[PDB]
Structure 1
Amino acid sequence: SMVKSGKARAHTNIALIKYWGKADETYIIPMNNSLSVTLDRFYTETKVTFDPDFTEDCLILNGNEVNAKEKEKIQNYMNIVRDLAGNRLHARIESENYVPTAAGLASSASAYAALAAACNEALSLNLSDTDLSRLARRGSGSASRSIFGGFAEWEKGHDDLTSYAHGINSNGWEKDLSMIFVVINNQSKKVSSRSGMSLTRDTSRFYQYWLDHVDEDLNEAKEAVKNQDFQRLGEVIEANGLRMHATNLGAQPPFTYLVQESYDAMAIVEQCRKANLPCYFTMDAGPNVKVLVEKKNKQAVMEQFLKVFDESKIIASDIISSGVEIIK
Structure 2
Amino acid sequence: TGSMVKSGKARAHTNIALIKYWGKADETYIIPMNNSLSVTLDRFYTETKVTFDPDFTEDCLILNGNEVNAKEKEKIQNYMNIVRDLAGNRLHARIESENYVPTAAGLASSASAYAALAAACNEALSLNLSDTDLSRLARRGSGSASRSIFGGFAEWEKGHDDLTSYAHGINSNGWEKDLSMIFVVINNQSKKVSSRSGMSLTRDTSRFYQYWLDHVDEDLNEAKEAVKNQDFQRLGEVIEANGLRMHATNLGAQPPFTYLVQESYDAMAIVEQCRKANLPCYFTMAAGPNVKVLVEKKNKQAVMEQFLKVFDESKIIASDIISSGVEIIK
What's the TM-score bracket when you normalise by the shorter of the two chains? Answer: over 0.9
Residues 243-279 of structure 1 deviation map (CA, whole Å, 9 limit, x = unaligned): 0000000000000000000000000000000000000
Give the match's secondary structure for 1:251.
coil
Instruction: Give per-residue Cα distances to partners, 1:64-110, cap 9 Å, x unaligned.
Output: 00000000000000000000000000000000000000000000000
Q: Report the counterpart of residue 178 of structure 2 in structure 1.
A: 176
Measure, in 2, the Cα distance between the counterparts of 1:220 and 1:250: 25
Quote the Cα distance in structure 2 between the aligned partners of 1:225 and 1:17: 13
| Residues 103-132 of structure 1: CA deviation (Å, up to 9, x unaligned) | 000000000000000000000000000000
* Partner deviation per Cα, 1:9-60 (whole Å, 9 max, x = no partner): 0000000000000000000000000000000000000000000000000000
For 2:119, the equivalent position in structure 1 comes to: 117
Residues 149-170 of structure 1 deviation map (CA, whole Å, 9 limit, x = unaligned): 0000000000000000000000
CA distance in 1, matches of 2:107, 2:159: 28
Q: Distance in 1 between matches of 2:18 and 2:11?
A: 22
Find the residue that maps to 1:138 and give its secondary structure.
Answer: helix
Deviation at 1:4, TM superposition (A): 0.2
Scaled by the length of structure 1, the TM-score of the pair is: 1.00
How many angstroms does 1:327 deviate by? 0.0
CA distance in 2, matches of 1:252, 1:283: 21
- Gaps (5+ residues) in structure 1? none
Report deviation, 1:5: 0.1
Measure the CA separation in 2 of the matches of 1:315 and 1:167.
25
1:19 aligned counterpart, secondary structure: coil
Q: How many residues align?
A: 328
What is the alpha-carbon distance in structure 1 between the residues aligned to residue 173 and residue 65 of structure 2? 40
1:256 alignment partner, SS class: coil
What SS does structure 2 have at the residue aligned with 1:103?
Answer: coil
Residue 158 of structure 1 is matched in structure 2 by: 160
Alignment of 1:26-41 (within 5 A): 26-41=28-43
Helix, strand or coil at the partner of 2:137 = helix
1:261 equivalent in structure 2: 263
User: For the residues of structure 2 that align with 1:236 and 1:63, how far apart are their CA atoms?
Assistant: 42
1:303 aligns with 2:301: no
Matches of 1:14 and 1:251, distance apart in 2: 24
Cα distance in structure 1, aligned partners of 2:88 and 2:198: 35
Distance of 1:197 and 1:148 partners within structure 2 = 24
Residues of 1 paired with 2:199 and 2:327: CA distance?
A: 30
Once residues 169 and 4 of structure 1 are traced to their aligned partners in structure 2, the CA distance between those partners, rounded to angstroms, is 34
For residue 3 of structure 1, report the CA deviation from its aligned partner.
Answer: 0.4
Measured on the aligned residues, the alpha-carbon RMSD in Å equals 0.2
Match of 2:20 in 1: 18
| Deviations 1:187-216 (CA, angstroms, capped at 9, x unpaired) | 000011000000000000000000000000
**Hey, what's the Cα distance between the residues in 2 that align with 1:226 and 1:105?**
29
Residue 213 of structure 1 aligns to a residue whose secondary structure is helix
Secondary structure class of the residue paired with 2:295: strand
SS at match of 1:79: helix
Aligned-partner Cα distance in 2 for 1:104–1:268: 20
Q: Structure 1 runs of 4+ off > 4 angstroms?
A: none
Give the superposition deviation at 1:292: 0.1
